[PDB]
Design a protein around this ligand. Structure first.
Ligand SMILES: [Ca+2]
Ligand SMILES: [Ca+2]
Ligand SMILES: [Ca+2]
Length: 173
């Protein structure tokens, strides 16, 4: 609906080329899970059960885009699959059903919440250095946090964490 907005194209090309480990111009579910799941869960020292839950959510999202283990797909076919999925997930949201992004969101939240508190604080948030994996100054970090904390509660709930961490896949601005 707004998934055909031309601004979406450039963003998606850069992400595709980053997930394409061997640089051959096509991606598999093998390459995606390694970059988007194996790396983060090891970095944050998640438990085996936590890691397994995260992997299930990542496999579900990308299979909905048309991906499978051992199957090579180029950019034009990948983009069309994502459009199809984003449309059908918009309708689920409207029918008061749980979506694939919400389910992936809960799995991520459990890993970052090291004590048992049910909110994410600044010390917990800083533990992961993002996918590009290069750290800016301590001062840019702390202002990015304040920006993500929409109300001024001093911490992050599930809706706030999900929008910053996985917003790339469903919203342009
Ligand atoms: Ca490849
Ligand atoms: Ca906490
Ligand atoms: Ca908050």
């Amino acid at each position: 609906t707004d998934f055909d907005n031309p601004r979406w194209i450039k963003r998606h090309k850069h992400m595709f080329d980053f997930l394409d480990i061997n640089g051959n111009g096509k991606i598999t579910l093998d390459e995606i899970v390694s970059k988007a799941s194996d790396d983060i869960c090891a970095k944050l020292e998640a438990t085996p059960e936590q890691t397994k839950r995260h992997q299930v959510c990542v496999e579900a999202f990308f299979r909905g885009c048309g991906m499978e283990y051992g199957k090579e797909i180029a950019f034009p076919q990948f983009l069309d699959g994502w459009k199809q999925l984003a449309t059908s997930e918009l309708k689920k949201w409207a029918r008061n059903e749980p979506t694939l992004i919400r389910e992936w969101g809960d799995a991520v939240f459990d890993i970052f919440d090291k004590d048992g508190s049910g909110t994410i604080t600044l010390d917990e948030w800083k533990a992961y250095g993002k996918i590009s994996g290069i750290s800016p100054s301590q001062e840019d970090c702390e202002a990015t946090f304040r920006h993500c904390d929409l109300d001024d509660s001093g911490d992050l709930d599930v809706d706030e964490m999900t929008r910053q961490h996985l917003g790339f896949w469903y919203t342009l601005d």
